[PDB]
């Protein structure tokens, strides 16, 4: 094939042009995002039971839905929460590769059939089924500076005048309202209701009657009387549209003639649906819009389109309303692309310099400058065909592949330049002979590198999803590089390169280039003399090899494991957790103090603080809160002292002084949709109907035993909430029946007043909105207020609530967890320093077996992921090693010789481990893929040395040591050229401290350190490996 395209350079140019156009077309059309779909398909069923406790929600909603989640395909596990906010979340996680649309519709459909089994109040509110596995592109904050609007007022404007227009914007997947539109709030008064002998039942009955749609008919409707001229629709009572109209709702008519209206026994205003959340942006009231990116959408275009559409709404905003951008990932992805494009261009520039430094002609330096972009462009076209997006994983996949792409260009051109120098052949004839020497090896290398990288794609779960992004990217880039090296580069060499005279190595020149040639020629003679000395006493280096292999194995165990490096994304979180039973106001004071700190102490770093009171991802009680801190630009925060990690540690140490509030600052993870993915996620299950109390006792027993092993387990917390005091009230049936008070009227009066009650809909400026009836705050705060509520009996007398009820204090769950249908309690934790996750998980299983009878366990989240992903690893390592051996065996026509190549692996790995250990980095995925590229390029160098050494012994009939010395002499220059270019190429990634520095550091450090050892050791050790293996097996 090389000989074909040397005689046909135009056909080679045509293939180059087609790849460039296909690549250029792909760059325009390819989707753009921060990360691809890594987390498994998850479907969260969300419902709301206003004024309901955790057990009421569980025993009427959660258990009923759970029981009807059958005949759904590819379901791994089901986990649900039921808490005293009156909320349920049932998350069904599915197998990796499952269609999320088919997954959602099957869950949706089984829920629809179970809707008649739920209570009317839950059916009225309704149940939502959404994909929860996806994450936000940006969070658009909406505030009021002039202090004319509350958070309820802002939320209504965003719902009415913004949300819909943002949803219709190009590339916008989903829009969640951070708050709710207005609700007609009837704030009932028990003193006024008792005065006119009325109840919340009378208020609900009146609102349902006097605010409703009424079907009428038509004038002259079919079938008509013959001779009818006019046909018109009859409009009857439509829904009410103002607080004034709701005020005039007639409740009672007295004997004297006075009219008892709804405004006479309640305050009426437009308010929020729920008052649990108090969102503030630097003290001011705030709402927002959580925007998610659509499938196959461009993140850069979508963000620009969102900002463009928000600009069009500027003139129509009320006075003091402003748009803010606390969370936006697009700036990060903008830098991610710019830094990767810089690395690829700098890499090509460094090849141009190194090619000119050694070969010393411009015609030679142009050949890699053409060939490398052709391969990189082609890679985008293959990624487009596989349906991949331009993301952080695929972008760093290109950067790690540069070493392999650059080598293909240098190896082919340098070998042609050498053949012309030594034999004195013209360019065309020299290229035919040069390609003849390497064409077999290049095909062999392709199959070896395939066997290394392809098995990485077939890992299972979230880990395997990330490994798949690097695998397909590197294999595609490497594959095209070999095709370009056999099709295009040979044609370019034959046409562009000039002839060189026999025995001309640029020693006759003067200046810098004259000095360099004479210096390098003597340096090559020093190298050959050194290898000659090494090959006389091989035994001593086999001992030094074992020291490196033992040193490698030692550093592997010592170096701690992680998932991804935490990045400075210009945002971090500060959780606020008060003691159990603490009110909303107490939590607000701590958040106000936390907001005050960041605007005072960190005024140079912090841009804003989004104080979300009564919010939390593991339940939303009044005592818990959270503050999303947004920072200034990366240029405005110079040095390590002004980064997120530094601000986190200073903030956490500052807030530890505060009493009656557990307050910690913490950085976001790399993939925010997935989480930390480091420790373990344990589930303790009630397997024999023991109950809540006995499962609590079993949990406390496990936590107590976990504390007795600091050496293995650490940071072992339950994800759930502790039991809290709750106001148990027992309605006496006999006393209620005796006085003539119905249980419906009692339970409605209590539920509607204290809990709230969604009555019906009303139309506010051409938008359907809810009508809630509830007690005014002051009449539903303390147990004493129970007696102030009166219910009318059958005989007409008003009976106080105290007359037919008794109350006491008891303990109950404010958040009940369930796993796979049965009651559960989720327990977190991580392996102690030195110990692996495997050991920590193994001890938790041992401690779990000594818990009481009918108490089981299971692993969930990343623990479930890693256990199935872990079993696959040995097989994929085995397949990789076996096929690499088989491929090399076919290349060399020998069972023994392959071992000479495969013994290079530790030489590259040891340097990566030293660099990671020295700089103090972790064994993350960027490092692990970094090893394969270092092993791949080091293995590639060894293959060409052994091929040259073997071909000299077979064809030219030279001796073992003669061939080995002549081989490494010929291969010294190209190995140093590639290494010099690639080490300088990844040097900026090591020293980088800006945005996306964590990933760059992980990619750079491992490769640089690995390439230094891989280059320096292998040039001496590959000689030893070949001679020892050749001596041993004839």
């Amino acid at each position: 094939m090389p000989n074909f395209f040397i005689d046909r350079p135009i056909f080679a140019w045509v293939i180059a042009i087609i790849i460039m156009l296909a690549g250029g077309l792909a760059i325009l059309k390819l989707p753009v995002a921060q990360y691809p779909t890594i987390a498994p398909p998850a479907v969260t069923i969300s419902a709301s039971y206003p004024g309901a406790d955790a057990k009421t929600v569980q025993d009427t909603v959660t258990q009923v839905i759970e029981q009807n989640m059958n005949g759904i395909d590819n379901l791994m596990y089901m986990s649900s929460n039921s808490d005293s906010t009156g909320t349920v979340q049932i998350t069904l996680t599915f197998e990796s590769g499952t269609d999320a649309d088919i997954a959602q519709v099957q869950v949706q459909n089984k829920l629809q059939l179970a809707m008649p089994l739920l209570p009317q109040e839950v059916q009225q509110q309704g149940v939502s089924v959404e994909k929860s596995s996806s994450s936000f592109l940006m969070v658009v904050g909406v505030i009021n500076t002039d202090g004319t609007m509350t958070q309820e007022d802002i939320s209504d404007y965003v719902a009415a005048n913004m949300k819909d227009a943002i949803s219709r914007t190009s590339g916008v997947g989903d829009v969640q309202l951070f708050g709710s539109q207005y609700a007609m709030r009837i704030w009932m008064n028990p003193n006024e209701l008792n005065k006119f002998q009325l109840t919340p039942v009378d208020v609900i009955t009146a609102i349902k009657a006097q605010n409703a749609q009424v079907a009428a008919g038509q004038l002259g409707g079919t079938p008509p009387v013959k001779g009818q001229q006019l046909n018109a629709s009859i409009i009857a009572q439509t829904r009410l549209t103002s607080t004034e109209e709701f005020g005039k709702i007639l409740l009672k008519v007295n004997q004297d003639g006075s009219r008892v209206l709804l405004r006479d026994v309640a305050k009426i205003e437009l308010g929020g649906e729920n008052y649990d959340i108090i969102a503030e942006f630097n003290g001011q009231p705030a709402s927002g819009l959580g925007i998610k990116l659509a499938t196959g959408a461009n993140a850069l275009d979508t963000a620009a389109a969102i900002r463009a559409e928000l600009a069009k709404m500027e003139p129509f905003f009320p006075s003091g309303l402003k748009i803010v951008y606390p969370y936006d990932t697009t700036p990060f992805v903008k830098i991610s692309i710019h830094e990767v494009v810089k690395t690829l261009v700098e890499a090509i520039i460094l090849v141009f310099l190194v090619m000119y430094l050694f070969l010393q002609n411009f015609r030679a330096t142009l050949i890699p400058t053409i060939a490398v972009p052709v391969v990189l462009l082609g890679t985008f076209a293959v990624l487009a065909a596989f349906g991949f997006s331009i993301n952080t994983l695929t972008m760093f996949g290109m950067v790690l592949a540069i070493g392999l792409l650059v080598d293909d260009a240098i190896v082919v051109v340098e070998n042609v330049e050498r053949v012309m120098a030594e034999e004195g052949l013209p360019p065309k004839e020299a290229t035919r002979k040069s390609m003849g020497q390497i064409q077999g090896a290049l095909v062999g290398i392709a199959m070896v590198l395939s066997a290394v990288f392809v098995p990485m794609a077939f890992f299972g779960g979230s880990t395997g999803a990330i490994y798949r992004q690097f695998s397909i990217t590197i294999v595609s880039a490497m594959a095209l590089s070999v095709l370009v090296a056999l099709i295009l580069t040979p044609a370019l060499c034959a046409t562009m390169l000039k002839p060189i005279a026999k025995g001309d190595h640029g020693e006759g020149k003067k200046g810098f280039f004259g000095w360099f040639n004479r210096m390098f020629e003597k340096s090559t003679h020093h190298y050959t003399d050194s290898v000659g000395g090494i090959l006389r006493s091989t035994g001593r280096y086999l001992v030094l090899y074992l020291i490196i292999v033992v040193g490698m194995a030692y550093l592997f165990v010592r170096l701690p494991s992680s998932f991804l490096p935490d990045e400075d994304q210009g945002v971090f979180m500060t959780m606020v957790q008060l003691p159990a039973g603490a009110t909303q106001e107490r939590t607000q004071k701590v958040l106000n103090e936390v907001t005050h700190y960041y605007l005072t102490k960190e005024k140079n770093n912090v841009e804003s603080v989004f104080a979300v009171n009564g919010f939390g991802f593991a339940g939303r009680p009044q005592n818990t809160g959270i503050a999303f801190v947004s920072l200034k630009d990366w240029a405005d925060r110079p040095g390590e002292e002004n980064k997120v990690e530094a601000i986190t540690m200073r903030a956490t140490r500052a807030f530890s002084q505060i009493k009656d509030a557990m307050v910690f600052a913490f950085n976001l993870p790399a993939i925010v949709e997935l989480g930390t993915a480091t420790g373990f996620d344990f589930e303790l299950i009630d397997q024999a109907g023991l109950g809540h109390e006995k499962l609590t006792q079993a949990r406390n027993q496990l936590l107590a035993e976990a504390a007795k092993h600091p050496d293995m387990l650490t940071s072992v917390r339950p994800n759930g909430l502790e039991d809290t005091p709750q106001f148990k009230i027992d309605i006496d049936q006999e006393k209620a029946q005796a006085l003539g008070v119905s249980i419906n009227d009692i339970n409605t009066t209590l539920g509607a007043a204290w809990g709230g009650s969604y009555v019906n809909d009303f139309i506010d400026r051409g938008r359907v909105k809810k009508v809630y009836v509830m007690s005014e705050a002051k009449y539903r705060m303390l147990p004493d207020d129970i007696g102030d509520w009166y219910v009318r009996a059958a005989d007409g007398q008003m009976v106080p609530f105290s007359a037919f009820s008794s109350s006491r204090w008891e303990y109950g769950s404010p958040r009940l967890e369930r796993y796979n249908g049965l009651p559960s309690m989720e327990i977190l934790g991580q392996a102690a320093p030195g110990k692996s996750t495997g050991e920590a998980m193994e001890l938790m299983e041992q401690l779990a077996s000594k818990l009481p009878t009918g108490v089981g366990y299971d692993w969930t989240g990343m623990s479930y992921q890693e256990r199935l992903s872990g079993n696959q690893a040995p097989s994929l390592y085995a397949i990789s090693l076996i096929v690499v051996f088989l491929c090399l065996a076919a290349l060399y026509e020998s069972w023994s010789i392959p071992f000479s190549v495969m013994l290079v692996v530790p030489l590259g790995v040891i340097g990566a481990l030293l660099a990671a250990t020295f700089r103090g980095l972790t064994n993350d995925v960027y490092f692990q893929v970094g090893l394969l590229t270092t092993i791949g390029l080091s293995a590639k160098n060894a293959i060409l040395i052994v091929e040259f050494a073997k071909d000299l012994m077979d064809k030219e009939g030279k001796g073992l040591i003669e061939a080995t010395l002549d081989a490494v002499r010929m291969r010294l220059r190209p190995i140093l050229m590639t290494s010099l270019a690639f080490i300088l190429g990844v040097m900026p990634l090591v020293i980088s401290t800006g945005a996306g520095s964590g990933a760059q550091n992980a990619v750079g450090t491992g490769v640089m350190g690995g390439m230094v050892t891989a280059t320096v050791l292998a040039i001496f050790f590959v000689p030893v490996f070949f001679v020892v293996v050749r001596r041993r097996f004839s």
């Binding site: 003691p579 039973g581 009493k659 406390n700 005091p725 006496d732 006999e734 006393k735 147990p783 008794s806 109350s807 006491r808 204090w809 303990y811």
Partner: protein, 156 residues
């Protein structure tokens, strides 16, 4: 609401005997309470921790302390079927005829959940068997309504 007092409440609730012992030595407030008005003795009696009830009483804990609705630790001990704690409280001068806000005595609560042994102990220490709640119902009226033959025979 002292620092050690809040730790004694959580310790007494969980049942950490070793931690309670240390807090009694450091001088933790035995008469400290949460928002509902529950002392460590209330919590220890509720969750059925015999040792901590004994330790708290020795360190001058109020046996007849009541919450915001008038319930004493003897109510909680009698209601949730803790025979040992009921005896220990009554030995340390627990009011056997203690009425809450609803007029519910420990005898009413013990009768309702059918704790036969606790009813005998309460009657021994001088429980008023004819004591009525706010609805005018005795411990006998609870036994006949629940349909407890054994309990009805004892309350003769």
């Amino acid at each position: 609401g002292s620092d050690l007092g809040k730790k004694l409440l959580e310790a007494a609730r969980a049942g950490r005997d070793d931690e309670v012992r240390i807090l009694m030595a450091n001088g933790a407030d035995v008469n400290a309470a949460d928002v509902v008005g529950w002392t460590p003795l209330h919590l220890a009696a509720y969750w059925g921790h015999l040792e901590i009830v004994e330790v708290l009483l020795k360190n001058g804990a109020d046996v007849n302390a009541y919450d915001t609705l008038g319930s004493t630790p003897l109510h909680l001990a009698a209601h949730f079927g803790h025979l040992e704690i009921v005896e220990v409280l009554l030995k340390n001068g627990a009011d056997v005829n203690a009425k809450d806000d609803n007029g519910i005595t420990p005898l009413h609560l013990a009768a309702n959940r059918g704790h036969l042994e606790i009813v005998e102990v309460l009657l021994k220490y001088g429980a008023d068997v004819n004591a009525q709640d706010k609805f005018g119902k005795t411990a006998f009226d609870i036994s006949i309504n629940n349909g407890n033959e054994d309990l009805a025979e004892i309350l003769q």
